[PDB]
Amino acid sequence: RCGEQGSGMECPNNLCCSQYGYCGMGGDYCGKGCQNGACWTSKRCGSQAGGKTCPNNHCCSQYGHCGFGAEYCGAGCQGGPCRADIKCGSQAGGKLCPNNLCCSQWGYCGLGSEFCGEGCQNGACSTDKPCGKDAGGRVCTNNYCCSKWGSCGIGPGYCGAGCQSGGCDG
Amino acid sequence: QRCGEQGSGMECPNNLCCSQYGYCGMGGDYCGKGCQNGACWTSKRCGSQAGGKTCPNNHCCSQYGHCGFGAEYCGAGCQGGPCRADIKCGSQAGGKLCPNNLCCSQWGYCGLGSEFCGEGCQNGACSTDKPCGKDAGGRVCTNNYCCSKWGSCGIGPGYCGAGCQSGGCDG
Numbered sequence: 336r337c338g339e340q341g342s343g344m345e346c347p348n349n350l351c352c353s354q355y356g357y358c359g360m361g362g363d364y365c366g367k368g369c370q371n372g373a374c375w376t377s378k379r380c381g382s383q384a385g386g387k388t389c390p391n392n393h394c395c396s397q398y399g400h401c402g403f404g405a406e407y408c409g410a411g412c413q414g415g416p417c418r419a420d421i422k423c424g425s426q427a428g429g430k431l432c433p434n435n436l437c438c439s440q441w442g443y444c445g446l447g448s449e450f451c452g453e454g455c456q457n458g459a460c461s462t463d464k465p466c467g468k469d470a471g472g473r474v475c476t477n478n479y480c481c482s483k484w485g486s487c488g489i490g491p492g493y494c495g496a497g498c499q500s501g502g503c504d505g
Numbered sequence: 506q507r508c509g510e511q512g513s514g515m516e517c518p519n520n521l522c523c524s525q526y527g528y529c530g531m532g533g534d535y536c537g538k539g540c541q542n543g544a545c546w547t548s549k550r551c552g553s554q555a556g557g558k559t560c561p562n563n564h565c566c567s568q569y570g571h572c573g574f575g576a577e578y579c580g581a582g583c584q585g586g587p588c589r590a591d592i593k594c595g596s597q598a599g600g601k602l603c604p605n606n607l608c609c610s611q612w613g614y615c616g617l618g619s620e621f622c623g624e625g626c627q628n629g630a631c632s633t634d635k636p637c638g639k640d641a642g643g644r645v646c647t648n649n650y651c652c653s654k655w656g657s658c659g660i661g662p663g664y665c666g667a668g669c670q671s672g673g674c675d676g
């Protein structure tokens with residue numbers, strides 16, 4: 336299942352999540368009731384939608400609609416994989432990258448070893464620095480949960496029993 | 506309920522990692538060894554370097570065939586996903602299809618949204634929903650989409666199952 340019926344799961348290759356939480360293509364999926372993917376009626380995002388982000392890594396246009404191509408990812412792009420470089424980190428007042436993108440040592444948002452590897456400042460860093468009581472009490476970035484084992488992440492093993500800090504369950 | 510191979514190739518929201526066990530999260534247990542999609546610490550391979558495989562989660566395929574985001578991945582040499590360069594398609598570019606079900610606009614560019622998927626859309630996830638099959642003079646869908654017994658194009662058991670007239674029907 337996808338969307339609401341499956342913890343916000345998204346379909347592969349821009350397939351549409353129907354109102355019943357099934358992946359497909361055509362009116363019964365992409366038409367009325369479409370939850371995510373290549374929905375015929377584009378989702379709202381950005382300033383026009385209270386800062387809401389686009390699903391499926393779609394770009395948020397200057398008009399607050401989700402999609403792909405120059406009109407969405409080009410000039411005035413508000414979110415998603417915008418064509419413009421996106422600044423983050425201590426170079427930009429500690430600004431986080433949206434959608435868990437990694438902030439590189441240089442203060443740019445992205446994914447891949449150049450971003451998530453050595454010097455990664457926030458997001459889905461691969462550096463896996465220890466947190467919690469055995470790490471001076473370092474809290475994770477992005478409000479990620481610090482597990483009882485002193486590692487940062489999201490999931491029952493991080494946010495559940497023994498969660499030391501972050502988005503711990505409650 | 507599950508992601509990855511445990512959940513019909515399902516993908517996590519917001520680049521969350523699908524663990525080797527088909528659950529969504531962040532950190533080593535999900536993004537580390539066994540990660541299936543999302544922000545895997547070891548980026549998936551794509552493009553020419555990997556048999557033309559496309560990146561999951563709509564990540565960019567860099568010139569070197571690794572999945573990710575940023576100028577290094579979506580900029581110069583980008584082979585797939587939301588590349589920064591405009592992507593040509595349709596009659597303007599020899600009837601080329603768009604990847605990942607993206608719509609080919611009236612102008613022959615790949616994208617998503619009404620400008621691309623609306624009037625004049627040539628292939629991909631067009632919202633124009635033009636008829637197919639016995640009542641459309643035997644016309645077939647683009648992208649090898651299934652034509653349902655009802656005469657509409659799509660993918661799913663209602664389109665590809667019983668009564669399927671053309672496309673990638675079941676069997």
Ligand SMILES: CC(=O)N[C@H]1[C@@H](OC(=O)NCCCOCCOCCOCCCNC(=O)O[C@H]2O[C@H](CO)[C@@H](O)[C@H](O)[C@H]2NC(C)=O)O[C@H](CO)[C@@H](O)[C@@H]1O
Nearest residue numbers: 377396398400404405406407591610612614618619620621
């Ligand atoms: C982006 C956005 O948020 N769009 C909204 C918004 O949509 C619009 O506002 N649409 C207005 C239609 C666009 O008309 C505005 C004029 O644009 C000026 C530029 O010239 C227009 C035609 C030439 N553009 C063109 O041919 O673009 C193509 O080629 C370009 C290369 O030159 C390429 O960069 C573009 O990506 C191409 N665009 C397509 C669709 O192929 O509201 C809609 C209704 O709620 C909504 O559905 C839509 O999602």
Ligand SMILES: CC(=O)N[C@H]1[C@@H](OC(=O)NCCCOCCOCCOCCCNC(=O)O[C@H]2O[C@H](CO)[C@@H](O)[C@H](O)[C@H]2NC(C)=O)O[C@H](CO)[C@@H](O)[C@@H]1O
Nearest residue numbers: 420439441443447448449450567569570571575576577578
């Ligand atoms: C990371 C970053 O912030 N890049 C920024 C940043 O870029 C720079 O600062 N670039 C200037 C030089 C970078 O600083 C040099 C030190 O960093 C070294 C990083 O290591 C790069 C080594 C080459 N990597 C490589 O080949 O990766 C490929 O193979 C890897 C191993 O298999 C694999 O993990 C990668 O995924 C591969 N990369 C790609 C793109 O496929 O600012 C730019 C604006 O000025 C901005 O556009 C750019 O996005």
